[PDB]
Each structure stands twice: as C-alpha cells, then as structure tokens.
Amino acid sequence: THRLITLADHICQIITQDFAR
Amino acid sequence: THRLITLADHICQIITQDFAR
C-alpha cells in the first residue's frame, strides 16, 4: 500500500520532525 | 492509505472476481 501526501504536507512534516529531533 | 494498481491489473481482478461469483 501507499501513503499519498501533498508536497506541502510532506514539507511541514519533515520540518516538524526535524525540529523535534 | 491507498492501493495503487494499474488500470490493466484492476481490469483482470474485476474480471476474475466476476467469473468466480
């Protein structure tokens, strides 16, 4: 299966995850 | 999540399922 995610939502996720590390 | 399936593979599935009913 696949996760379908907008380019915008992927960007916020990665920024969020990056700042929480 | 999503299932990503080629139009061709979806067609065979539906034919197969339809003939097995």
Place this chain on the structure above:
Amino acid sequence: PTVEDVISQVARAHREIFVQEIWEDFSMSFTPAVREVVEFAKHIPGFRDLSQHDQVTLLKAGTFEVLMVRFASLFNVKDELGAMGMGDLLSAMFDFSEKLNSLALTEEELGLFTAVVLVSADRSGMENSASVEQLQETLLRALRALVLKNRPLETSRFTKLLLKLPDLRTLNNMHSEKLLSFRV
C-alpha cells in the same frame, strides 16, 4: 446464426447494458464499467460457447479497448483532469472519440462495432484460437452487412471502422498501465 439475429441480439444487449478525490472518483468508475462489459460479452451470440479460459482471456485482453469505445460516446464537445496522470490518457481518449464520432455510427453499428472490438483482442493464450476467430468473422460479417444496408455509397465505411482497431491496440499498449488509486 443469421446476420439479422446477430445484429438484433447485439444491438439490444448494447442498449440495455450501456484533488486526489478526482483520481479516486475516476478510479472507481472502472469497476462497474468492467462489469458492464462482462455482461455485454455474455449476450454476444457465441461468446459463451467459447471455453471459460478463452472467454476470460478475451475480456482481459480486450476490455480496456472496449472501454475506450464506451468513453468515446460518453465524451463531449467542450470536454482539467491532467494533474492525476490521466492527462495523456483522457486526452488520447478525446482524440480517438473525435475520430470515432466523425463516422456517425448508429446505435446498431456502434453496438456491433463494440462487440467486434472485444473479440478482436490479442489472442496470446487461447485454448481454441480458431473458435475465437470464427466468432470474430461472424461479427464482422454482420457489421459489414449492417454498414452497407445503412450507407451503400460510402464503401470505405466498413474500412474506416476496421482502421480503429490498430488505434485501439496503440491506446491499449500505451495507457493500460496507468495507475488507479483506491483508499485502503
């Protein structure tokens, strides 16, 4: 059976049976459409005398091309949905249907053409390829009669219809691999 029976039977069956939200919506269009094609096939004189394997093999091989013909009518004049990757498909489907509509097929002609398309699919895998071929010839025989009763002076009418077949093979060979999407 008789050319008139075939025309009558096929034409009748044809008349009776026929954001990412856009991609999901397109994707689930195909399931009832494929089932419509399967039911139509069952009404084609002689289809259900083919073996189960051959029947199933033809629908797998030929259903996408039949859908190209069905979409053809269900198109328009105006007409987008490019962003899902169905861009070059629905845009290929538009150009094919334009071509198809120039012939101005009657419903009998279209119904019988559609049946011809299904049984004119690639026969790689046939248990009895000869039986599939006798069926193809029966249907093309009827189609030729029909078209010549309808338009006697356009003698290439049947020729133009037969020329849609390579086109359908090409659309098939290029677009049957397009991705559908279903929310799991």
Place this chain on the structure above:
Amino acid sequence: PTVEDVISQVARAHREIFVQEIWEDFSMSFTPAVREVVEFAKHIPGFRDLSQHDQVTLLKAGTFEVLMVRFASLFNVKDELGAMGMGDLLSAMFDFSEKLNSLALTEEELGLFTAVVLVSADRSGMENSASVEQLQETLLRALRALVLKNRPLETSRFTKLLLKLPDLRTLNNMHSEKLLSFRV
C-alpha cells in the same frame, strides 16, 4: 552585521549545504532536500534569533519556493515525467529556471537570493513579524550591494531578481498541493 559578513556567511552555507517507481523516486527526493533547506536556514545570519515558532513558520511557508530555486540550478538544457502528475509542475519548474538562468547569477548572488526567498515567505502566523522583516531587509540590503558591485551598468538586475518573488508565490500557490507517494 556588516554587508560583507552576510554575503560571506550565506554564500559559504549555500556552497557547503547544496512507472510508479518514478513517482516514488521523485517523492523521496524531497526529504533530504527539505533537510538541506532547514540546515541552510540555520546558517542565515539572524534566522536563529527569531523565535522557534517564527523559524518553523517561515520554513513551512517558504521551503517549497526555495526548492523551486534549487531545482532551477539542478535542471538542464535538454531536460517524460508527465504521467505521474508532476507534469505541469516539473514543466513549470523548467520555465521558471529558464528565466532564472537568463540572469546568470553567480554562486554568491544565487546563495543570497535563495536566503531572501526563504525569509520573504508569507508571514501569516508570525509571533514577531517585525523581526522577520528586519531580517528580510538585511538580506535584501546585502543582495543589492552584491549585485551592484558585480554589474554596475545593469541597474535593473536587482529589480529582475525581486520580480522572481511573485512568480515563486504563484508556482507555490499552484503546485504545493501536488501529491507525493510513499510505499507504506
């Protein structure tokens, strides 16, 4: 700090830090790219004096546009990938980059332009919007110096660069909603 420090610091950071298989491959390109942008931002004089909220708000708002600038260099002359739905995107990204390359920015100019783009993002949600703006002005001040030391007779050079900003807002407003795909 001094115009020379800013140019030097930014340019350095910029130099250091920078079937459906095609769609998956494109999709995972973005994760390291976004992390590259986040690290670059941290090297921008004054970025890390903004509050955590404002920092994060700018990256969310401005990272797609920065990626448009980064792709710009990573494009080509020749150049397809239309069928995934990244058609009108990568094709918009091609036309933007063509425009960008006509300016023939040096690496310092490009580095400092890139930083200007990040801090020139839409400020809906700023705890201290004034601090974001002082930073923007600092960077635009340096960029203007740099561009005028480099090409004194082209006085609209800085003007042309500033005109890329509305373009980036448009690419952003149209394509940031493109779907990515990740095999679960």
